[PDB]
Amino acid sequence: FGYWCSPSPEQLERLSLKQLAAVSNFVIGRRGYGCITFQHDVDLTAFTKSFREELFGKIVIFRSSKTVEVYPDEATKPMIGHGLNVPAIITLENVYPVKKPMKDTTKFAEFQVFDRKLRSMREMNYISYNPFGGTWTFKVNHFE
Numbered sequence: 001f002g003y004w005c006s007p008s009p010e011q012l013e014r015l016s017l018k019q020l021a022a023v024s025n026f027v028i029g030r031r032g033y034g035c036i037t038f039q040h041d042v043d044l045t046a047f048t049k050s051f052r053e054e055l056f057g058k059i060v061i062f063r064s065s066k067t068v069e070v071y072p073d074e075a076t077k078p079m080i081g082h083g084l085n086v087p088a089i090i091t092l093e094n095v096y097p098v099k100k101p102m103k104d105t106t107k108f109a110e111f112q113v114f115d116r117k118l119r120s121m122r123e124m125n126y127i128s129y130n131p132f133g134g135t136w137t138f139k140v141n142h143f144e
Contacts, residue, residue, distance in 0.1 A: 002031040003056035012044060012051045020044045028055060032093060033062035036070070039087040039139075046083055059084070066095045066134075070143040080142040087141050089127065095134040105131050 005012075005028040012020065022041040029035030047054035061069045070084055071077035078085045096103050097114035105111065111131045118136060119126045127137040 001057055002033070003052075003060075003062075004029055004031065005051075005055060009051035009055075017045060017048070020048065028060050030062035033066075034068060034090060034092040036060070036068065037089045038084070039089065042086060043083055062092075066092055068092060077143070080144065085142050085144070087139070088143075089137065089139050090124075091135060091137045093133065093135055095129075095136040096131075101134075103134065 006025065007015070007023065012023070015023070021043045023044050024041050026038045026042045026044070027035060044051070047059065059071060061072060063069065068090060080086070094101075097110060097117075102110060102114075108131075115129050115131075118124075118129050118138075121138070123140065125139040127139060129136050
């Protein structure tokens with residue numbers, strides 16, 4: 001389904017359970033949708049039954065609605081600082097203003113309105129937005 005991560009699931013299984021509690025450089029994405037780049041070590045010990053099945057489209061979901069969800073079950077979402085509920089940089093692809101998607105890049109003024117909207121988001125801290133592709137990069141402190 002286009003999902004991927006680094007370390008890859010095959011690499012994560014070659015770690016010990018104590019190594020899996022602090023995995024560095026963790027990155028998970030879905031091709032054609034986006035990517036999450038975690039800012040600090042993450043604890044992946046909740047997912048050992050199957051990294052691929054637990055993570056790819058279950059715990060992490062990139063949806064066709066141009067958004068991303070981490071721990072969709074509220075009861076399972078860890079405290080901030082636990083698991084994957086930690087700071088990250090996110091890129092989402094094909095994000096556009098509006099009643100279909102407005103992707104006419106000759107319309108710079110409307111794109112500018114949309115861009116200021118993104119810049120003003122309080123939870124999703126703006127990094128960049130490219131109208132050519134609708135590529136929105138931002139930072140979050142957690143996934144609450």
